[PDB]
Amino acid sequence: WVIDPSELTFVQEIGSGQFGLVHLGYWLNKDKVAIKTIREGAMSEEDFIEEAEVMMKLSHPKLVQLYGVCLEQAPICLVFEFMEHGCLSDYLRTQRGLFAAETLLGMCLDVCEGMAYLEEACVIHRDLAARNCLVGENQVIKVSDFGMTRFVLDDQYTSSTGTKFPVKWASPEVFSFSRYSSKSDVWSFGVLMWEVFSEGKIPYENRSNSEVVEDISTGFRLYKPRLASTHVYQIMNHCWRERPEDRPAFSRLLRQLAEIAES
Ligand SMILES: NC(=O)Nc1cn(-c2cccc3ccccc23)nc1C(N)=O
Ligand SMILES: NC(=O)Nc1cn(-c2cccc3ccccc23)nc1C(N)=O
């Protein structure tokens, strides 16, 4: 799963990510690619390479394909399928006011299809959010970065008590005990649905991390976005049930969301 540096060419910079630069490039005899350079010390590289044999086999039309790793010299880089329209969060904000309700539900269905595949594969995403979803040809949405937080070395991001912890997308058992499951991914998915129907608004903007924990623990939930129907908002609330056992599985959500789309 190792890509030799002689098999990669960098064409143009497309931006800056959490761990370094992202470039548009080519992979010899394969395809056009997105290459993410990873700063030394940002991830547990040895742990990551160890799991490639099993994880690289994961493949689905609604998942961004990781093609391989270039590790001859530091900084290392990850080579991915190129997604023409970039991150979902930015795409929603740039096109705000131009979306039909059916297009927004369709985006949620694509994410749900990818997540149902990961659920069946017994793979936990751990940080599902619009910022981790990509937009491809003909507005297809694909999920990316599943399981990556298991390798991140910044304690301020990974610890539930950390200053940069993504509390806004965390279920109560995640913010309390780092208890991850496909059911904690369902909670995150409900928040992702709110980001989609609000056209890229940031959840709980008027609250600090501790205020979010206190509000959620006392039963408060995000308000219904204007573009979300009462049936769609009911599904969002099912993702936000306090007990993980009471939340629907992704296989169940996929059937329920598909029924809403058709009718
Ligand atoms: N056209 C694009 O902007 N594509 C892409 C943008 N990205 C990015 C994903 C996550 C964070 C990023 C930060 C900065 C620039 C690109 C990023 N990945 C792709 C991809 N895999 O094609
Ligand atoms: N867009 C992505 O993040 N894709 C992917 C990420 N991963 C991985 C997730 C977690 C740990 C991994 C360890 C090694 C190689 C791939 C991994 N596998 C894929 C894949 N098979 O496409």
Q: How far apart are CA 67 and CA 44, in angstroms?
A: 19
Shared domain for 162 and 175, answered yes or no, is yes
**Count of structural domains within the chain:** 2
- Close Cβ partners of 142 (under 8 Å, ≥ 6 residues apart): 61, 62, 63, 64, 81, 83, 110, 114, 133, 134, 136
Shared domain for 63 and 119, answered yes or no, is no
| CB 134 less than 6 A from any atom of ligand 1 | yes
Angle 161-165-167 from CA coordinates, rounded to 5° = 95
Shared domain for 162 and 184, answered yes or no, is yes
Hey, how many other C-beta atoms are within 10 angstroms of the C-beta on 5?
Answer: 11
| CB 140 less than 6 A from any atom of ligand 2 | no
**CB 203, CB 195: distance < 8 Å:** yes
Hey, how many other C-beta atoms are within 10 angstroms of the C-beta on 258?
Answer: 14
Cα of 172 to ligand 1 centre, how many Å?
30
> Comparing C-alpha atoms, which of 138, 198, 131, 134 is closest to residue 169?
131
Mark 236-257 as b/e (b = at least 16 C-beta within 10 Å).
bebbbbeebeebbebeebbebb
- Ligand 1, atom 11, lies closest to the CA of 17
Shared domain for 108 and 188, answered yes or no, is yes
| CB 19 less than 6 A from any atom of ligand 1 | no
Domain with residue 3: its CATH number is: 3.30.200.20
Q: Which ligand is nearest to the CA of 145?
A: 2
- Please identify which residue in the block is written with the tokens 């904000």: 93
- Ligand 1, atom 13, lies closest to the CA of 17
Shared domain for 262 and 163, answered yes or no, is yes
Hey, how many other C-beta atoms are within 10 angstroms of the C-beta on 98?
Answer: 8
185 is known as an active-site residue: no
Shared domain for 134 and 63, answered yes or no, is no
* Boundary residue ending a domain (52, 82, 112): 82
**Residue 46 belongs to what H/E stretch?**
helix 45-50
Q: Which of 110, 127, 145, 185 is catalytic?
A: 127
Domain hosting 192: range is: 83-263
Experimental structure resolution, Å:
1.7
Amino acid at 161: T
- Please identify which residue in the block is written with the tokens 């009911």: 234
- Please identify which residue in the block is written with the tokens 């793979």: 123
Shared domain for 147 and 173, answered yes or no, is yes
Shared domain for 89 and 175, answered yes or no, is yes
**CB 65, CB 59: distance < 8 Å:** yes
Domain with residue 245: its CATH number is: 1.10.510.10
Residue-by-residue DSSP string for 62-104:
TB--EEEEE-SSSSEEEEEE--TT-BHHHHHHHTTT---HHHH
- Please identify which residue in the block is written with the tokens 């789309």: 261
Cα of 22 to ligand 1 centre, how many Å?
6
* DSSP state, residue 26: E
| CB 94 less than 6 A from any atom of ligand 1 | no
Breaks (C-N over 2.5 A) in the chain follow: none
Cα of 246 to ligand 1 centre, how many Å?
35
* Boundary residue ending a domain (15, 49, 82): 82
